[PDB]
Enzyme design. Sequence first.
Site, PDB file in Angstrom:
ATOM      1  N   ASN A 112     -18.571   0.505  -2.699  1.00  0.00           N
ATOM      2  CA  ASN A 112     -17.810  -0.230  -1.959  1.00  0.00           C
ATOM      3  C   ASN A 112     -18.432  -1.621  -1.233  1.00  0.00           C
ATOM      4  OD1 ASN A 112     -15.293   0.675  -0.230  1.00  0.00           O
ATOM      5  ND2 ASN A 112     -16.526  -0.319   1.424  1.00  0.00           N
ATOM      6  N   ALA A 141     -12.790  -2.581  -8.167  1.00  0.00           N
ATOM      7  CA  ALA A 141     -13.979  -2.091  -8.743  1.00  0.00           C
ATOM      8  C   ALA A 141     -13.807  -2.126 -10.391  1.00  0.00           C
ATOM      9  CB  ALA A 141     -14.450  -0.842  -8.297  1.00  0.00           C
ATOM     10  N   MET A 198     -17.901   8.043   2.497  1.00  0.00           N
ATOM     11  CA  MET A 198     -19.092   8.518   3.157  1.00  0.00           C
ATOM     12  C   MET A 198     -19.852   7.148   3.953  1.00  0.00           C
ATOM     13  SD  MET A 198     -19.160  11.637   3.239  1.00  0.00           S
ATOM     14  CE  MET A 198     -20.932  12.102   3.177  1.00  0.00           C
ATOM     15  N   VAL A 199     -19.179   5.976   4.302  1.00  0.00           N
ATOM     16  CA  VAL A 199     -19.788   5.168   5.084  1.00  0.00           C
ATOM     17  C   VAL A 199     -20.866   4.194   4.556  1.00  0.00           C
ATOM     18  CG1 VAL A 199     -18.280   6.180   6.656  1.00  0.00           C
ATOM     19  CG2 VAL A 199     -20.611   6.243   6.954  1.00  0.00           C
ATOM     20  N   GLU A 213       0.768  -1.306   0.025  1.00  0.00           N
ATOM     21  CA  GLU A 213      -0.121   0.136  -0.022  1.00  0.00           C
ATOM     22  C   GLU A 213       0.809   1.229  -0.155  1.00  0.00           C
ATOM     23  OE1 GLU A 213      -3.000   1.069  -0.413  1.00  0.00           O
ATOM     24  OE2 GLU A 213      -2.419   2.943  -0.100  1.00  0.00           O
ATOM     25  N   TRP A 269     -17.760   9.366  -7.045  1.00  0.00           N
ATOM     26  CA  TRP A 269     -16.657   8.599  -6.653  1.00  0.00           C
ATOM     27  C   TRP A 269     -16.724   7.106  -6.754  1.00  0.00           C
ATOM     28  CZ3 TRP A 269     -18.491  11.997  -2.879  1.00  0.00           C
ATOM     29  CH2 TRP A 269     -18.024  13.225  -3.016  1.00  0.00           C
ATOM     30  N   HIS A 270     -17.586   6.615  -7.784  1.00  0.00           N
ATOM     31  CA  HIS A 270     -18.117   5.119  -8.188  1.00  0.00           C
ATOM     32  C   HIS A 270     -17.225   4.629  -9.324  1.00  0.00           C
ATOM     33  CE1 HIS A 270     -21.835   5.955  -5.296  1.00  0.00           C
ATOM     34  NE2 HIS A 270     -20.980   5.833  -4.585  1.00  0.00           N
TER      35      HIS A 270
END
Length: 520
Positions: free
Chosen positions: A504, A492, A99-100, A32, A457-458
């Site tokens: 997510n 993704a 944003m969870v 990472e 953001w997808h």
Amino acid sequence: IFDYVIVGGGTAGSVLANRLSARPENRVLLIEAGIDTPENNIPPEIHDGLRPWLPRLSGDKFFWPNLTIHRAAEHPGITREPQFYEQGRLLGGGSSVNMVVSNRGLPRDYDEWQALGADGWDWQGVLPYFIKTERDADYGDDPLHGNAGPIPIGRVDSRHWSDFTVAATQALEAAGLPNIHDQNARFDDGYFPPAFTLKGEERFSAARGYLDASVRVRPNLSLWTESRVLKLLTTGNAITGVSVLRGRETLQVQAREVILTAGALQSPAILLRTGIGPAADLHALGIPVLADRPGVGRNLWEHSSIGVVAPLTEQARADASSRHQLGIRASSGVDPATPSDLFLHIGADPVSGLASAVFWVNKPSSTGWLKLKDADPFSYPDVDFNLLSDPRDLGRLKAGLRLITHYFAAPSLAKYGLALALSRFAAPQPGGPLLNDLLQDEAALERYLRTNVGGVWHASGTARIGRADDSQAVVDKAGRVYGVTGLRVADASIMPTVPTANTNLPTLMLAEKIADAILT
Ligand SMILES: Cc1cc2nc3c(=O)[nH]c(=O)nc-3n(C[C@H](O)[C@H](O)[C@H](O)COP(=O)(O)OP(=O)(O)OC[C@H]3O[C@@H](n4cnc5c(N)ncnc54)[C@H](O)[C@@H]3O)c2cc1C
């Protein structure tokens, strides 16, 4: 020599490092590029789950700095600007800075994946992986849910809703919308408390879930933080390792298998640099061609977004007295094939003094692409989401806006007397025209939308699973890159289409599934 080198310790990378290393004979390295987030020392901006927008207030700190993209399709009489696209750069990746919200999409999304060539990625086939990832606090014992998974999912209680949210819900009921309660096991239109992932008031990233301390002490798992993979090492058509930058020093690491999980914009740039992509593009960059795969970086999906804001009137501000309160799945009516193609949120923020109705095309028709600018491992790709290239998406956004008009006309919300104006999605603010006026002027509304359409953001689809005879496919049903050996993609990037969902939970699922394919 690692059995598996996993490039990118984000949402997908975290799952893969955990699941692969569950077998002790598997020597697994997770690399990472960003900072570690040890569970006992998560940056406080990251750690705050009630205020999940906080990381985006630290500028570049937690993202890929200066990663710019084109958003809307090029169109006469508009000059596009590049726009900064947030992507996580740290352990947990997007799950560390998002944003969870945690939702799955619709069965029809995945049945379409299979129909497009991803055998076993139909709803029946992905659903066990949605179950296995989650521990649903509200419905975990029910048939389409899991109760044992690493990622908690929960919803606010409807009784805890603000008077403002209630009023919106009465408006939606007046338009014939039900409370569907559980967006993740109920798949028709309506409204619900959104499912989100938190632990108490804390963010719970995939690094917390999959890379906790017990996992970290596995002798067969190596975790390299602040370490950037620069190139894939090849021999013949076989991927054989990675060159990695740590401090100022570059290292080579040998690998049986490289798995790319570097995000939908950077996973395909790495392929392209390796010589896996459209041949003429690579030739044009002097990159020797391993495999002519013209789908690499094509099929770039996103959700196309816009805002409506209104200053809060006294009644609305009183009524608006942090967690995700309300979501709305709706149909634009633009295409019979695409029910539930709009997602909407209605709420109020006494802090900025705005009521907001933000929404996006959740089942779009438009796709774009990304290419290399040059061969440099340090460059970002050239990215063009090509939004609203297909006019149905423009139709959908206009439909969404009419729906908002309709809902805000209902007694329950019209009593507040909000004057709604258009806004950018990502930081909603004044400056856009009045909603009622723009909806009266079609060309002006088309221009506004084309100018101010955002993403959510997808980013996805840049290394799609496809059928083994499909020239435009990139990976097979287990993520193996067609045309080379030793290489998988498992983020993704592999989605044949973006789901009707925030990406997510579907990325967790797909990584669980791909891990399974590997272990099987
Ligand atoms: C601001 C924001 C908000 C979002 N909100 C939500 C939301 O509320 N709900 C939701 O469901 N989805 C949302 N998403 C999307 C979701 O988080 C992403 O789709 C998901 O994280 C994608 O996972 P991934 O593994 O594909 O990529 P990522 O999690 O982005 O992981 C990629 C990882 O690779 C690393 N990396 C990249 N290149 C290299 C390299 N060369 N070397 C080493 N490491 C590298 C990165 O640092 C990163 O950690 C959001 C995204 C953003 C940016």
